[PDB]
Design a protein around this ligand. Structure first.
Ligand SMILES: CCCCCCCC/C=C/CCCCCCCC(=O)OC[C@H](COP(=O)(O)OCC[N+](C)(C)C)OC(=O)CCCCCCC/C=C/CCCCCCCC
Ligand SMILES: Nc1ncnc2c1ncn2[C@@H]1O[C@H](COP(=O)(O)OP(=O)(O)CP(=O)(O)O)[C@@H](O)[C@H]1O
Ligand SMILES: [Ca+2]
Ligand SMILES: [Ca+2]
Ligand SMILES: [Ca+2]
Ligand SMILES: [K+]
Length: 994
């Protein structure tokens, strides 16, 4: 730790005893680690307080049933008719279903956090440091950075520790400090000191804070402090504003829940109210209060039964299960709604380089000018072997190896690639491979300079660590880089102003070396470098240079091309304004053309398969890239966006082609064009913004700082694991696997969660309709009471409980990836689905009342027939039908209540077997597609047998169901509910026309 930030650049270097160009010694590092510890912060928390997650009794529908358990517990405190054994089990049956789902919800949610944290250890963050054991920059694990290290950071990098800025290698350094200071805009830094030791972090405009991201520039610095002493570590476990929000679907269901709970409120009043004439009946002594209290209980028992109380627990389960499946697909879910929103996605925007391609850059062809005579232009065209960043290859002309030093044009070409370059090359001794340090478009050029070896440098006795930057360092010693005109993306160019090293070994004057996209650079070239001389640019030579780039980009290799050029007469150093990012283009004029490199970039093997599945699922894919239009369309054909010989005139625009269009035509272009090339960061955002104007659900995919604005505005933003930290900050989901096909399975998971809620609702609603049809149909037809406060509570537990919750684990419906995407405008329940809710609930409520009735009439077992009976309650109360045979107290017998309740339980277990799909019959999706449903079904059925055959229980409930002909009648009544919905699924299966 250096206690202050206010020290000069010399003092910070002297406080630790370190060299600005060497870095810490391996001895200083070993001795700082055991003194200052690693660069770590403890895992913030596990988020499972063992208490905070259990307390999910917070939704309305759960704390309603908590109310019912209180009043049924107080009504147990008043004892009537020895109901104590039955009154005190009333609140426990209510609480048991609430506990049954709370166990599942807390399980799947902790089980999902176990997978997210386990995916943080996947790819450990690393930094860029200078240390004495190596001569060039080195990749080390970020936790190993100690104070005193010399750390280098550039665009996209996340700052690994608090750093005092020693030197800024760009014209301006701009940092994103939104996470720490709240400054929602990039801010400028500098190296001049600030004196106040207490000046707040906004005033410390000379340092870089851990956790913050570098927006623009490239700077060198020294690590002030690491670990929990970091300015962000002081706020890890202390200050924060934790962001939690309900998803668009989770909020839609809270609306559906509250409006439904008030409808049941009217029902349970309409049930209490219709039985006003039964308050004085002699079942409870005729007392008005001792009769009204009883029917107040059945309204409570009807409410908790009708209320779908597993809803807030099954939503948490499906979301936690979806996050846990994407974490198993190596996909970090940074925002919870991202899995469900990506399901109804209709348009996928996608970056080209790195995103759709492997970003395994390697130069394979290059060319320089051979002859210029009138209209004739001749090219010295070379081929380069080697497909990795290893400096192991040969340069070939006419299919035989040549020495790059022969051709003077190749010397200047290697000199441009080596100098105009902010990326180096580091050897990983563990992996044994050379890794890119910096942007891959530049490391590709770094490897080319080593393969060329244009000065014939003794590289044979160099170690595999020293060999990486061998031939580059030779060129970096010939001319000194005075300042860099960094990469802008307005002009699509990078430039450097260099001077000869000794001013005596070379007095050739100053030079600027510029590389950038060919179309912009060649327009700014008035000259052509032929050998060691210079000729004026002409029409013929220009078209020849352009026609080769057009062939290399549209050929079978779809090559990425850069242009290399030197300015021979640069402005004097004092003459240049290093402030305006707009004027840098002017400085890059009157250039002399050197050559063009053709780089190789293989598309990811998963891409072509992943687009096939998007078009079948009705999801349109658009390539968005800054790269050449010729290369962009060619890559689209290779990956499958376009046909091998499809015409593409109307569906591919450049950046300027797009902006020449009026606004109305720009939007129409976004709705037909699948390829946008030569775009800028603003173009990427406006394309997504136009797609959202058509109420599309747009998803952006990108990895570099290039397309961070497009990732934010898009409904869902997916970043690559290899990408910059700037993009990962702006993404709601990260693919640590770089596996593009994970996006498709996420769309499947996003569709499956919705299709599994549509069945959780179809089950409980249609099942609980019959539970309300039952209650009204008996009181309306004059039939006696067929259920009991504790009987509704039992049907609630074994039918609205785990069998309902286990519907969340339903597999994806068959044609879920063959139907077009869901519009977020669609209603939760359609006009047709509300019909099937009633057609089932009707037969559920009619089959349960006809079960107790059948026992009265056709039983001819135990009690006998009552073939056409008005069933007046009084008949046994007092003979009033003038019957010679009155059948005293045959009403209210225990067998019909048991008879009706078994149907009402079995018919809903049968109904759950239809809740596997929305329209697919059991012929195509059998009941064993969800094992955990069949487990919960046996759970309800057997646990229902205990309250009928272990002897002390059928007195708390009412008595046994008989042996053979009673369960056969319950079963033969219930099973037709499957055939009913089976027909209803067949009707809609072939009646979608309209
Ligand atoms: C003899 C005649 C038949 C008798 C039948 C009796 C049934 C007895 C056994 C039942 C076991 C079935 C329980 C099913 C639970 C329903 C919810 C559910 O489907 O869950 C399933 C998850 C699965 O795990 P996964 O998603 O990670 O696998 C993913 C693997 N892939 C991806 C391939 C799917 O498992 C989880 O959620 C976590 C598991 C925790 C279990 C919670 C449920 C237990 C509840 C206990 C309280 C009830 C009190 C009882 C009252 C009586 C007085 C004592
Ligand atoms: N470090 C760099 N230095 C100089 N020129 C670069 C460069 N990186 C890219 N270029 C060229 O300038 C142009 C503008 O850069 P750009 O924004 O287009 O990145 P890009 O589109 O090539 C990566 P992506 O396809 O992921 O968007 C590119 O076409 C490229 O040929
Ligand atoms: Ca219920
Ligand atoms: Ca990219
Ligand atoms: Ca039920
Ligand atoms: K957003």
């Amino acid at each position: 730790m250096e206690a202050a930030h206010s020290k000069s650049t010399e003092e910070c270097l002297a406080y630790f005893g370190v060299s600005e160009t060497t870095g810490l010694t391996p001895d200083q590092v070993k001795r700082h680690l055991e003194k200052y510890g690693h660069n770590e912060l403890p895992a913030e928390e596990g988020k499972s307080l063992w208490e905070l997650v259990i307390e999910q009794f917070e939704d309305l529908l759960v704390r309603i049933l908590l109310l019912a358990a209180c009043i049924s517990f107080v009504l147990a405190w008043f004892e009537e008719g020895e109901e104590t054994i039955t009154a005190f089990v009333e609140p426990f049956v209510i609480l048991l279903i609430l506990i049954a789902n709370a166990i599942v919800g807390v399980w799947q949610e902790r089980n999902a956090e176990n997978a997210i944290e386990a995916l943080k250890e996947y790819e450990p963050e690393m930094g860029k440091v200078y240390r004495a054991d190596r001569k060039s920059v080195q990749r080390i694990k970020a936790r190993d950075i100690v104070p005193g290290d010399i750390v280098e950071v550039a665009v996209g990098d996340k700052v690994p520790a608090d750093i005092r800025i020693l030197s800024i290698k760009s014209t301006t350094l701009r940092v994103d400090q939104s996470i720490l200071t709240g400054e929602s805009v990039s801010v400028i830094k500098h190296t001049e000191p600030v004196p106040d030791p207490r000046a707040v972090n906004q005033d410390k405009k000379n340092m870089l804070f851990s956790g913050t991201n570098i927006a623009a520039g490239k700077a060198l610095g020294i690590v002030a402090t690491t670990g929990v002493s970091t300015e962000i570590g002081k706020i890890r476990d202390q200050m924060a504003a934790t962001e939690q929000d309900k998803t668009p679907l989770q909020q839609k269901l809270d609306e559906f829940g509250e409006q439904l709970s008030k409808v049941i409120s009217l029902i349970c009043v309409a049930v209490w109210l219709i039985n006003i004439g039964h308050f004085n009946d002699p079942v409870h002594g005729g007392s008005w209060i001792r009769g009204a209290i009883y029917y107040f209980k059945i309204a409570v028992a009807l409410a908790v039964a009708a209320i779908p109380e597993g809803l807030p627990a099954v939503i948490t389960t499906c979301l936690a299960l979806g996050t846990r499946r994407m974490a198993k697909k190596n996909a970090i879910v940074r925002s919870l709604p991202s899995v469900e929103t990506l399901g109804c996605t209709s348009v996928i925007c996608s970056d080209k380089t790195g995103t759709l391609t492997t970003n395994q850059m390697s130069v394979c062809k290059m060319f320089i000018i051979d002859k210029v005579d009138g209209d004739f232009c001749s090219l010295n065209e070379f081929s380069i072997t080697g497909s990795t960043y290893a400096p192991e290859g040969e340069v070939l002309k006419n299919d035989k190896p040549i020495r790059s030093g022969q051709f003077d044009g190749l010397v200047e070409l290697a000199t441009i690639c080596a100098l105009c370059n902010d990326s180096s090359l580091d050897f990983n001794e563990t992996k044994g491979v050379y890794e890119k340090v910096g942007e891959a478009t530049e490391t590709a050029l770094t490897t080319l300079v080593e393969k060329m070896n244009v000065f014939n440098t003794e590289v044979r006795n160099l170690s595999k660590v020293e060999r990486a930057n061998a031939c580059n360092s030779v060129i970096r010693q010939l001319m000194k880089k005075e300042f860099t005109l960094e990469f802008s993306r307005d002009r699509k160019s990078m430039s450097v102003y260099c001077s000869p090293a000794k001013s005596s070994r070379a007095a050739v004057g100053n030079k600027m070396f510029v590389k950038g996209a060919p179309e912009g650079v060649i327009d700014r070239c008035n000259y052509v470098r032929v050998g060691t001389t210079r000729v004026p640019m002409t029409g013929p030579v220009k078209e020849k240079i352009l026609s080769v780039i057009k062939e290399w980009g549209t050929g079978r290799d779809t090559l990425r091309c850069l242009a290399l050029a030197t300015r021979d007469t640069p402005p004097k150093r004092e003459e240049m304004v290093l402030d305006d990012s707009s004027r840098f283009m002017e400085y890059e004029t009157d250039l002399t053309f050197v050559g063009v490199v053709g780089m190789l970039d293989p598309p990811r093997k998963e891409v072509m398969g992943s687009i096939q599945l998007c078009r079948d699922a009705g999801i349109r894919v658009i390539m968005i890239t800054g790269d050449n239009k010729g290369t962009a369309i060619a890559i689209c054909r290779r990956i499958g966006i376009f046909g091998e010989n499809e015409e593409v005139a109307d569906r591919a625009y450049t950046g300027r082609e797009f902006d020449d269009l009026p606004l109305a035509e720009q939007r129409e272009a976004c709705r037909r064009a699948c390829c946008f090339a030569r775009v800028e960061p603003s173009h990427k955002s406006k394309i997504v913004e136009y797609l959202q104007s058509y109420d599309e659900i747009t998803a952006m995919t990108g990895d570099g700082v290039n397309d961070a604005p497009a990732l934010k505005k898009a409904e869902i933003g997916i970043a690559m694991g290899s990408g910059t930290a700037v993009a990962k900050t702006a993404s709601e989901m990260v693919l640590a696997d770089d596996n593009f096909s994970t996006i498709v399975a996420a769309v499947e998971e996003g569709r499956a969660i919705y299709n599994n809620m549509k069945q959780f609702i179809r089950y409980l609603i249609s099942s609980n309709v019959g539970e309300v049809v039952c209650i009204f149909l008996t009181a309306a037809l004059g039939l006696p009471e067929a259920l009991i406060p504790v009987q509704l509570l039992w049907v609630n537990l074994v039918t609205d409980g785990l069998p309902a919750t286990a519907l969340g684990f339903n597999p994806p419906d068959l044609d879920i990836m063959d139907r077009p995407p869901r519009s977020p405008k669609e209603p939760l329940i359609s006009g047709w689905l509300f019909f099937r809710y009633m057609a089932i609930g009707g037969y559920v409520g009619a089959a349960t009342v006809g079960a107790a009735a059948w026992w009265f009439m056709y039983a001819e077992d135990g009690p006998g027939v009552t073939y056409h009976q008005l069933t007046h309650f009084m008949q046994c109360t007092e003979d009033h039908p003038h019957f010679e045979g009155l059948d005293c107290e045959i009403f209210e017998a225990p067998e019909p209540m048991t008879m009706a309740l078994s149907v009402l339980v079995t018919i809903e277990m049968c109904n759950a077997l239809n809740s596997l799909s929305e329209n697919q019959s059991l012929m195509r999706m059998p009941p064993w597609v969800n094992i955990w449903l069949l487990g919960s079904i046996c759970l309800s059925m057997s646990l229902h047998f205990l309250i009928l055959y272990v002897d002390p229980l059928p007195m708390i409930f009412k008595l046994k169901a008989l042996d053979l002909t009673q369960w056969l009648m319950v079963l033969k009544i219930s099973l037709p509910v499957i055939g009913l919905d089976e027909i209803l699924k067949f009707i809609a299966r072939n009646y979608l026309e309209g």
